[PDB]
Amino acid sequence: ASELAARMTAMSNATDNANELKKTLSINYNRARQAKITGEILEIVAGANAC
Amino acid sequence: EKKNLGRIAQIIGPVLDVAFPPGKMPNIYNALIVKGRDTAGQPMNVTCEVQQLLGNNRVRAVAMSATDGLTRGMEVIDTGAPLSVPVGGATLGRIFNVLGEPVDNLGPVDTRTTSPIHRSAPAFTQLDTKLSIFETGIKVVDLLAPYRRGGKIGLFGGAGVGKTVLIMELINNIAKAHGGVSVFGGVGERTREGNDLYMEMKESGVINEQNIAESKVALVYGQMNEPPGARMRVGLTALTMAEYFRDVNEQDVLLFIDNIFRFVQAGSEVSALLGRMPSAVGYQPTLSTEMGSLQERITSTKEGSITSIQAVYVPADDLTDPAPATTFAHLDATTVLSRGLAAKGIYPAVDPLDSTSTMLQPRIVGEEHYEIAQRVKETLQRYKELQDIIAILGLDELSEEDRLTVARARKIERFLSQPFFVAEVFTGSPGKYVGLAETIRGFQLILSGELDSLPEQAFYLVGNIDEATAKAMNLEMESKL
Amino acid sequence: GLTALTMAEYFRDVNEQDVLLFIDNIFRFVQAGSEVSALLGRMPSAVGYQPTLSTEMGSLQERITSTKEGSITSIQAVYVPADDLTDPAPATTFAHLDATTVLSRGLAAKGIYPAVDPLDSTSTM
Amino acid sequence: GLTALTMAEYFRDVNEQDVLLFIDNIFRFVQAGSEVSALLGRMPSAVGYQPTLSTEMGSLQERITSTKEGSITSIQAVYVPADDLTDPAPATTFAHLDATTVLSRGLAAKGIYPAVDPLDSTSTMLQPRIVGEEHYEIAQRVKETLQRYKELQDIIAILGLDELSEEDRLTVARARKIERFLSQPFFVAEVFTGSPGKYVGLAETIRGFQLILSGELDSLPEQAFYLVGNIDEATAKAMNLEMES
Amino acid sequence: ATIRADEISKIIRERIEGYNREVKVVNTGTVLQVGDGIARIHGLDEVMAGELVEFEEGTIGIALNLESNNVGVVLMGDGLMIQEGSSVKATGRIAQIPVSEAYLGRVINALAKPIDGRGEITASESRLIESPAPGIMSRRSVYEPLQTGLIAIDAMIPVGRGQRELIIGDRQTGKTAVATDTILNQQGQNVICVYVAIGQKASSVAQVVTNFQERGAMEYTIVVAETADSPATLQYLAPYTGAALAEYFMYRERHTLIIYDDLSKQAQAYRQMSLLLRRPPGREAYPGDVFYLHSRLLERAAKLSSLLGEGSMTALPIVETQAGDVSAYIPTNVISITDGQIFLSADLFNAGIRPAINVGISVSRVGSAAQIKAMKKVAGKLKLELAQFAELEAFAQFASDLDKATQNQLARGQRLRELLKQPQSAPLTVEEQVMTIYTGTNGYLDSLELDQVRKYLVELRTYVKTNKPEFQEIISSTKTFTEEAEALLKEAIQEQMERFLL
Amino acid sequence: MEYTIVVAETADSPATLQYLAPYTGAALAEYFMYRERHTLIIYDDLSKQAQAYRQMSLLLRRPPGREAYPGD
Ligand SMILES: Nc1ncnc2c1ncn2[C@@H]1O[C@H](COP(=O)(O)OP(=O)(O)OP(=O)(O)O)[C@@H](O)[C@H]1O
Ligand SMILES: Nc1ncnc2c1ncn2[C@@H]1O[C@H](COP(=O)(O)OP(=O)(O)O)[C@@H](O)[C@H]1O
């Protein structure tokens, strides 16, 4: 029973750390997605203005 | 306004270039009708709006209608005014396009009063500095996420939850409780959904079809079939119809917008067509100004107040995208609509914890209201955390304070329901209006141990806690019998 | 590519025999067009290709066809730039191929040569 | 930048003196060049920089050299925008520099001052013929344990330290000791912390890290290593901590 | 490039009529091609760059681009009623605003024109909008406090007079409660406050101005207000007119304060203006000159040396972040420009810790030079104990060494968290701040109740203000925590504790 | 096949025909719809029509937007 309690506590901590990591990774993903879109359209517009 | 006649010089999609006499050309944001010609054998005119002066007697416009079948050299009529829409009680219970034309096929509307859609906001002196609480009569919205008079509110509920029933209840309640009217503005309205909404508004008594002008709403529809010029300016048309009801009639107006994201989307489309360089994630460079010039006319003057309830779409489900990020610089409150609560029958399906509001502060709502709303939030949050433990242990293997918490939370969660005046037509229950005072007096009693010896199905689908005690006595008579 | 395709067209049509047409990187047939396209005065498309990518690819890919008088079985190598399968040049070939055989770098990095991705390489036969 | 470089170059050439050239933010040189080059009527580079960015950097950095007359030891701050080390301006500065020092926002926010990232900060003088073999071997072992720590960081982020092996947890503990001992109090930051700055010589640093990596100082707190120098002071601080309790 | 704007037919006809002659159109320019925040003007042969021009509608302009045949002016408003072909007139004056001592109590629309409705403002016209910043010999090291009235700021992030302190956070996380708190706390001091609202909705500007008028802070405050429905040029230019107005008082030996609300909104307006002028944008579509935009504005906040009258200007710029993104472009720009930041945090704001200063990531590069002797002596122990709490609450869910840590965290940290929180628009004087930090971080407020800490502290505050006038005298006389004030405060808090136990 | 019509414009077609194909499909189905019948139309890869329209819009030197797609 004490081993199962220790595993319950370890898995609660692991779920919470994975929750915070999911939040951080979603933040960095949205940043990279907006940066990708910005770069793509700025490159297209730069080519179209050079043309 | 006179014989200021232009001639089309360019037709590139829905963007036109018009040439004019050397001294007389319209200002920016000025309507001009294109006296065009249909191929079928009849004339048909096209309305455009000046966006830019180009130099030698030449402007550049954006068509509100389609530009197919237009030749170069058609006569363009300058009008000297912005887009002028009909305003007043003549625009009630009827459907309008971006130009103020009726499209509900009921007949013509009398242009006895026409206001321009391009107008400056109220002055800093004419603004009202008071923090009033708009009362919707709905228990969850009034208690946990209060509304502001003169502020904006974001609907975040997906498709299928009780959204349309909610805005119809808000219309009926602002008509019956206060002396207010409502103005629905459909930015990018799907046509079949527009027809369904108009039919349900006729049926729910909001649009009195047996007698128009007794109605409680004016519909403006900028549809997806329409060019990006119309879909962008339909919000301004709706805001002008609402601003007349504020200014002249001194009512408390309710301005419903559909997805304000499609307002931004049509703006980015017209900027891409006019050729301006895109902003950060590809939006128009005039994003914040295009949004603010709309949102700043939704205020509360000394006369009345426009309160807007704008549905908000978040692209890619992030709140840091420029259209959600610039919309949220104007939102005063927020109601999220729950798929789970709509499933388990807790209509109205507003999520109590995920709905926020900046009105919920002691200075604004009273220390009593603030403390009881915070206690309800704590109770529901504790129950949400404890559902897994009750699934494992059960209510018996809990503690006593936790058990009374769980029971009070089930009662509160069922008390956040309400039978609606407009949802009555298929549910049957007579529908209730619950002011904020009865809401907080009922939640005080359901939270302190004064009403704990009651069934959970006694608070469900009632208003006004006296009705909860009465239905409880009836549910106990069901047992005695 | 059009030269070799013409040589195969003759063997299919006039000689009426089963031709086997091996093509090396048809990514280069699109890349050469994207190189010259700016100098041709054309405005650039998505991520950097010519605006006529799909039509230029489609003309060549549609000339390759078994014609009920002779057949051409054509095995084509498509360089996927930066291992990005959602790049426009391979994305516009996926519509023109019958049995696509996507190669993985995660299998080559282990030695599962031929590093044919089993769950990505599908076929219509 | 050019006029400061000219003043230094006169001392290098004619006076034949060994000059120092402390430049703060050579990035803003690039940034102002981009600002004028937009208005100069030029098509911009990748991220809107000037098309003459590499040459504008090289025409300045190639005049900062050590000729037979003198030597210009130049220490330059290079700002990275939005913490983007792959940016064109620092990415073109990296080719001209011969001893870099990359600072980390994470190490700065963890109070580890100076915030020098130990694994990205390289040099062309860490060679056994130039710094001896003992310094080279200790720097190699420090970087190896820090690299092992950075490797298993994500596993010990989701799971925790409780799931590592014995040698891996010993590596973790020694890497935390190392990254605490790498911090130091500065003389110019005596207003930010107090506890005045310590000048730590070279041999004292080598001996301190030899003691950390050797296994002697495995039975004392990590906070004894934080914000000290000359590991005798880490031993004294561990004694003080276990005495004051 | 084969087409120009001056190649309209009337200009070429007037050139063909007489080729060689003497007199050009000196101050008479005719507008052509009114665009999007720009208008091109044929004429104005002797206009200056930076010169104000005036249109027939009444709109002000600024000559920016002086090409060979036409000058391109930037519209300082909605250029709607600019008839094409109408005349433009130069003024001979580089861009200025009238400055005076009579701006105190008025609300401005970035043009030194009142939107207040209380008539015009008399002034003596001076003070160019783009004034040069002080040099190196002109200024002096910061040495005196600017008391904000917040315990957390004044105790751990001290702000001095002449220091650029940034307020960076998310939306609805403070920064305006903080800015208005600092403005309202300036009642007794001789500080000329300036509030610039760059992109706020006009209702929030109304709330701020009515709060100022209600609490009495408009006798020394000017408000430069640009609402969200304004042209991007006016939102761009409002902080420069705010800085010029404050510099008028700064160079006359008076200490000023200026708060640029939403400098990220000014950068967004500058982005809109550059993109409409087709300039090549960098990262996040920003013009690349955005660092210069912010740096030439913030570099004016100085502390002038004794020869220049010993004036000062403190700047509290406010920057919003997207989900706490300190590593974005404009936040890192303002961080690289200013002298320290104040991080507000959405988790602590929404969780109830209401002045939500993220103390472990906020600095002030003046520090002890800003703080007085009393606050230094008292708040050293405070920042130490809060430092310990900062790792305890994060790493240890319950504790390691659970008995002493309960004597550590429960006694010090979780009660200092309730000690630091402070209501909206309620500043504290420096005596109450010193007293409150002393009663907490020495160890005296280690046995209270977690909801009774606030009531105990407010009642002890009023008690010491009512029954101990000599403590306030001996702290307002020397600004140093002497042993006499210490002992009398100790016996006074014992008196107040035995009073409040009942 | 007895109740079906197939509108096929393969990838060797000009961009104008691949842009026009869903509209001819909708016009035929609209004839049958307005004569009191029930129809069903399947647009196979509407994105291919979007790409054809992008190609012709870029070749007509029109201002591009995101992913070089035109504003309309
Ligand atoms: N210290 C405080 N005590 C009590 N209430 C506060 C405090 N600070 C802020 N608030 C409340 O929180 C709300 C938002 O605060 P504030 O006005 O400071 O942020 P903001 O600048 O409006 O954010 P943004 O403008 O970026 O959305 C305000 O309505 C205010 O009443
Ligand atoms: N208060 C209510 N009482 C009973 N049923 C409701 C209530 N609110 C919504 N519903 C039901 O839930 C469904 C919600 O659909 P609706 O909100 O109209 O979809 P949409 O949000 O797409 O317009 C409706 O069909 C309605 O019958």
Coordinates of N, CA, C and O in Angstrom, one line a residue, chain B residues 13 29 59 76 78 83 107 112 115 237 244 335 341 353 440 458 464:
Chain B
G13 N -11.1 42.9 -60.4 CA -11.8 42.3 -59.3 C -12.9 43.2 -58.7 O -13.5 44.0 -59.5
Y29 N -13.9 57.6 -48.0 CA -15.1 57.1 -47.3 C -16.4 57.9 -47.8 O -17.0 58.6 -47.0
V59 N -9.8 58.3 -58.4 CA -9.9 57.7 -57.1 C -9.9 56.2 -57.3 O -10.0 55.7 -58.4
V76 N -20.4 56.8 -63.1 CA -20.3 56.7 -61.7 C -20.8 58.0 -61.1 O -20.3 59.1 -61.4
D78 N -21.0 60.3 -58.0 CA -20.6 60.8 -56.7 C -21.8 61.2 -55.9 O -22.8 61.7 -56.4
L83 N -21.8 55.9 -47.0 CA -22.9 54.9 -47.2 C -24.0 55.3 -46.2 O -23.8 55.3 -45.0
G107 N -41.1 44.0 -48.7 CA -41.4 45.3 -49.3 C -40.4 46.3 -49.1 O -39.2 46.0 -48.7
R112 N -37.0 57.7 -44.5 CA -37.4 59.0 -43.9 C -36.3 59.6 -43.1 O -36.2 60.8 -42.9
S115 N -28.8 57.9 -41.8 CA -27.6 58.3 -41.2 C -26.4 57.7 -41.9 O -26.5 56.6 -42.5
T237 N -22.8 49.3 -40.6 CA -24.2 49.5 -40.8 C -25.0 49.2 -39.6 O -25.9 49.9 -39.2
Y244 N -28.6 55.1 -33.8 CA -29.8 55.9 -33.9 C -30.7 55.7 -32.7 O -31.2 56.6 -32.1
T335 N -18.2 35.2 -21.8 CA -19.0 34.0 -21.5 C -18.7 32.9 -22.4 O -18.8 33.0 -23.6
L341 N -22.0 20.9 -20.3 CA -23.2 21.4 -19.7 C -24.4 21.4 -20.6 O -25.6 21.1 -20.1
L353 N -16.9 28.7 -14.4 CA -15.6 29.0 -14.1 C -14.8 29.7 -15.2 O -13.9 30.5 -14.9
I440 N -28.7 36.7 -5.7 CA -27.8 36.7 -4.6 C -28.5 36.3 -3.3 O -27.9 35.6 -2.5
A458 N -34.8 19.8 -7.2 CA -35.8 20.8 -6.9 C -35.3 22.2 -7.3 O -36.1 23.1 -7.6
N464 N -35.7 32.1 -9.0 CA -36.3 32.7 -7.9 C -36.5 31.8 -6.7 O -37.7 31.3 -6.5

